[PDB]
Amino acid sequence: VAHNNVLPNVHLHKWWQHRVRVNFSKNIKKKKRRLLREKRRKANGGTPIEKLHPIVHCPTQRYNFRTRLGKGFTFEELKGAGLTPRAAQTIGICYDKRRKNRSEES
Amino acid sequence: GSIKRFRLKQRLGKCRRQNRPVPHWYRLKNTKRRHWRRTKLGL
Amino acid sequence: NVKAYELRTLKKKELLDKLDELKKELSGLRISKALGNSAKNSKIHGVRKNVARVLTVYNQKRKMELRQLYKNKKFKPYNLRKKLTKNKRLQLSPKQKAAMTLRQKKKVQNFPQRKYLVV
Amino acid sequence: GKAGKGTGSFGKRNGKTHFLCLRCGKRSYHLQKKKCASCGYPSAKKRRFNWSVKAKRRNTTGTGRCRYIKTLRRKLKNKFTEGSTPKPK
Amino acid sequence: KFNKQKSSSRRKMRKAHFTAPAGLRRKIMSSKLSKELRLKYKTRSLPVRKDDEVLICRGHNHGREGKVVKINRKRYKIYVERVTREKVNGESTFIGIHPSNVVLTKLKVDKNRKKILDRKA
RNA sequence: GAUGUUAGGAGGGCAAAUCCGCCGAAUUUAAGCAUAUAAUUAAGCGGAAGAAAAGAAAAUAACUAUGAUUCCUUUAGUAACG
RNA sequence: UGUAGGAGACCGAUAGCAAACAAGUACCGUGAGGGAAAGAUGAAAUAGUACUCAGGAAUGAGCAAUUAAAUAGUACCUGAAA
RNA sequence: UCUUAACCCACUCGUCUUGAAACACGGACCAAGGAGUCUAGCAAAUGUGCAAGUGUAUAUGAUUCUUUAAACAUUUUACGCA
RNA sequence: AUACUGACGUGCAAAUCGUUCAUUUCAAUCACGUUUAGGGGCGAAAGACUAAUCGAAAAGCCUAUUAGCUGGUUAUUUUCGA
RNA sequence: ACAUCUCCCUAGUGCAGAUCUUGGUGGAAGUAGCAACUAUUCAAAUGAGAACUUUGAAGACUGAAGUGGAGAAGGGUUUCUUGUCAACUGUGAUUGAACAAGAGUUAGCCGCUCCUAAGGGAUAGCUGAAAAGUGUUUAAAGGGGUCCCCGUCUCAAAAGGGAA
RNA sequence: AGCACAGUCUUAACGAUGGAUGUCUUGGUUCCUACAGCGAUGAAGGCCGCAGCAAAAUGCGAUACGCAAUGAAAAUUGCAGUGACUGAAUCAUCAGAAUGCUGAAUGUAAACUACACCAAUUCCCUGGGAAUAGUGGUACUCCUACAGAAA
């Protein structure tokens, strides 16, 4: 180190040269993903392949205002709907078994 | 040496057969050779 | 010279007699070639191919007869059985893979997935 | 001593203690200890060390014309049933 | 152009040009047909055969008509009766002509040729 | 538990780029060197596959909570360790 | 890695894979191993040096001779410097 | 222009070293090849676009499909940094 | 293999050759086969020997190890210049 | 097959030198040198051509611890006949252990092959992650017998043993 | 038909020498896309063969630079030789047939073409006749079944 230069924070002391990867497949990978889902939807008669999530709260002090897609409706919400677990699997709604359905408002 | 082994004798006879020069007709449609004194079979 | 279908016409005694005849002729050509004579040398290739045709036809007929002999009854001899990859041979059957417990059978039959629309 | 360390030593050289090796074909069978240096012949294991790339590559599948594997190629692509043929005229 | 199945490289096309199977050799031994014949057969160009009658349109030998002697598939050269040349020792052989340089007058008819003409028309 | 050229079957070995296990260093860095560093890297011995392993809560949170696995963007060169 | 495609603001025969090639070869090492040098006549040789003379022969020369071209003749493109 | 002449002047180049014409070191000769680069992160500089915002991340989308491996788009409290 | 510190010393030879000299019935010499392997062996001890290799063999790799030290470090003009 | 100075991007981008790398080449130089091992001569033949090929005559030498016979290792068609001379045969060369075309090694009895040894590799076990380290040592195991009595195996000598 | 000085150095011209330069390029190079295991039913590796004239990498395996079959399909050719006017000559495809000795390599062996043991074996013909010393099987571990022994 010399002059006004800040202390470095690089970790290239270990043999990184065989532990490094450069992405040149990105846009074609994106095309392949698009092609795969498009092919799948079309094969299913063009019927939706999309999954309908519950709305759930984002956690702690920072994100408590915000709400996002959750894992699955679970029994109390399904019972309130009048829908079976078997029906929930049969249809596009998202499925779970251990997400508690919490407060009344949610 | 003077007495011999059937496998060795056969391979040596092969090497001798391979050694002999190319057909001249082939050039009308020779990269490798051995000489016994200066090149041994290395066996 | 000789052509496969003509050989396939022949009975096994007749085909073998032709095979033996060709060997004797082939030997005569070979002896002639070994001698200082150059009269018939090129014909030896043709005869060797003719012998090859005889043997292929006889062997195909014999193989078919063996297959006819071991028609069904579950087991052909080892190397008359299916030669396929060792892995493919080892592999679990799709039929067995498909099969499932009674509770699984109930689950499948009762609850398959269905296709849908919206307004 | 006329067998001295240097030229004199080489005159007493006779009696090769390495031979060809049937499972090798590259001269490497130590006769005295009955062992191939290159391919490990008395052992079932083939002695295929990974510390030399040159040694690793200079014997490999596709050296020896591949008498069944070469034949196997294309069959995978084709996917005919075994025992099947083209149809007659 | 549009297909991405086949290379647009110089390199692959050349290798294919040199390593040709026989049907490919036959394709690149085709010659253009005579004008009324093109109308007759509905066909621009035809693979050369033994007893064909060609006219030369290029080289020092241009404007000569004649029957095809022998076809050399390997050097891609046809030989025609009146394009003789004497060699260094005065032996007479026929000049080999690449099939690009000849236009076909009377094609030889045969069963295989009939099938080709039936396929084309 | 033995014994069987009894009848039917299976394993062995090879190939290895990626994968999974074990077993497992040092040159090197600190301008010396011992802890630390190279690095749970290389070599060694094993096992697999067209991907493998992982995976359906003895989990994270302290919210208005989330809710199998994998991957990316990130947190983050940060809490922390020295 | 094996096989198959498609590529290039890549190299252009001392470069690029060790290998544009009969090279993982020759060759060297007791062996483990180590490991090369090595492409191009012309449009066409189904144009590859006919013929004559002098030569023991090699060769040489030619009034002779292919080619558009032979100080283009297969150790054949161009043919720098020393 | 080349060429010698002649008058006057004219010590082996590179090199490390305060100091080489040196009894300091390297250089028989000629040809080709032959040595401050690339990545990461940071800084100042200067350009450029925007400004209390900025970048559009992973990714989605399209009447985008030789060149397209880019280009184009993103149905109001994501994240980095400020 | 003692001496001639002989010849030889770009050899006949990376230890030869000549003459001299020691040994010659035993702790003898020779062959072949065999054993003991690398911080290991083996040593009538000289750190001797272990394939023209030894106060730690050969092969390959970590490795392009590291080097405050040696050497080299490539067209032109102009400006400021230790 | 070649340019762009019109503009601008990009780079394995500029050599005299590194005891540079690689390749070629000089002066040194027709020089150093071709000195172990007592010696050749004459005539003839062959051939283009003969000091050193062949034949003969002489002269000589090796001097049974032989430049003589045989065999082992090791080499491997080098052998032999028939050709032969681009390069090689450190001189010459018609010669040749070089090159070209062929030919040729014959076993009941000679060897190997067989037997065991010094040795080596395993089974049985047992350890060790395995790799390996060991080897009758906590075994239900090859032979002889009218169901009985015996028993670790295996390779290892081209000079030991070993029919002819 | 004469006349030159020599040697050394320099210059120009013209050649030898040498293989640079330039031009190529059925090769390399990196990336992206795509599929992706072989083996006791004997792989990979290694030998030994096999071409009319044939040494070699290539190719093939005792039917051996291909056999059969399919789709193309008239030539082949250094010489000899082999066909056509479409199962022939040529290719490509390649599913059928064939695939020496080995090699995990597995009857005991191994610087060996050495050596055991049990089955003698094959073909042809329509329930029989001929050939041939030839061909297989017999490793180690595991498993299921059976057996006769041992609680």
Q: Where is chain D discontinuous (C–N over 2.5 Å), named by the preceding residue? A: none
Neighbours of E69 (CB within 10 A): 15
Q: Which of E23, E32, E1 is nearest to E105 (CA)?
A: E32
Torsion of CA E74, E78, E79, E83, to 10 degrees: -130
Q: How far is the CA of C87 from the C1' of K113 (A)?
A: 37
- Three-state secondary structure call for residue E69: strand
Residue with tokens 């026989």: E22
Q: What are phi and psi of E67, to 5 degrees?
A: -70, 145
Cβ-Cβ contacts under 8 Å between A and C: the total is 17
Residue ranges of chain D whose CB lies within 8 Å of a chain B CB: 19-20, 27
Q: Which nucleotides of J are covered by protein (CB under 7 A)?
A: 71-78, 97-101, 111, 120-121, 131-132, 158
Residues in B closer than 8 angstroms to D27, CB to CB, are: 42-43
A8 C-beta less than 7 Å away from strand H: yes
- Cβ neighbours of A46 in C, within 8 Å: none
CA distances, E58 to each of E38, E98, E100 (Å): 20, 10, 9
CA distance B23 to B13: 19
C13: Cβ contacts below 8 Å, ≥ 6 apart:
none
Nearest by Cα to C44 from C34, C55, C58, C56: C34
Q: What is the C-alpha separation between C56 and C65, in angstroms, rounded?
A: 14
Q: Is E1 helix (H, G, I), strand (E, B) or coil?
A: coil
Nearest to C110 by CA among A82, A84, A94: A84
Q: Which residue is nearest to nucleotide K79 (CA to C1')?
A: B25
The DSSP secondary structure of C39-78, one letter per residue, reads SSTTHHHHHHHHHHHHHHHHHHHHHHHHHHHT-SSS---G
The alpha-carbon gap from D54 to the nearest alpha carbon of chain B, in Å, equals 21
At C11, give phi and psi (nearest 5°).
-75, 165
Tell me the C-alpha distance between C61 and C67, whole Å.
10
* Pairing mode of beta strands E92-97, A55-57: unpaired
Tokens of C104: 């699984």
Question: Does C111 contact A89 at a Cβ distance shorter than 8 Å?
Answer: yes
Q: Which residue is nearest to nucleotide K123 (CA to C1')?
A: C13
Among all chains, which residue has been given the structure tokens 């047909």? E33
Question: Which residues of D fall in the annotated binding site?
Answer: 21, 24, 32, 36, 39
CB-CB contact of E69 with E80 (8 Å): yes
Radius of gyration over alpha carbons of chain C, in Å? 29
Contacts of A48 in chain C (CB under 8 A): 116, 118
Q: Which chain D residues in 46-65 sit with Cβ < 7 A of strand F?
A: 46, 48-51, 56, 60-61
- State how beta strands E102-104 and E30-33 pair: parallel
3-state secondary structure of A30: helix
A94 closest-nt by C1' vs CA: F67
CB E20 within 8 A of CB E73: no
| CA C60 – CA D83 distance, rounded (Å) | 12
Give the rounded distance of the alpha carbon of C84 from its chain centre.
Answer: 13
CA–CA separation, C23 and C47 (whole Å): 9
Instruction: Write the CA distances from C29 to C18, C24, C88, D88, integer angstroms.
Output: 16, 9, 49, 36
Inter-CA distances, C26 with A11, C54, D50, E72, Å: 80, 13, 54, 35
Q: Which residues of D are annotated as a binding site for Zn(2+)?
A: 21, 24, 36, 39
Element (H, E) at D18: strand D18-19
What's the distance, CA A88 to chain centroid? 19
Put simply, whether B42 touches D (Cβ < 8 Å) is: yes
Header resolution in angstroms = 4.7
- Distance separating alpha carbons of residues B30 and E121, to the nearest angstrom: 54
Place of tokens 């205002």: A65
Q: Please give the Cα distance from E85 to C106 (Å, whole number).
A: 90
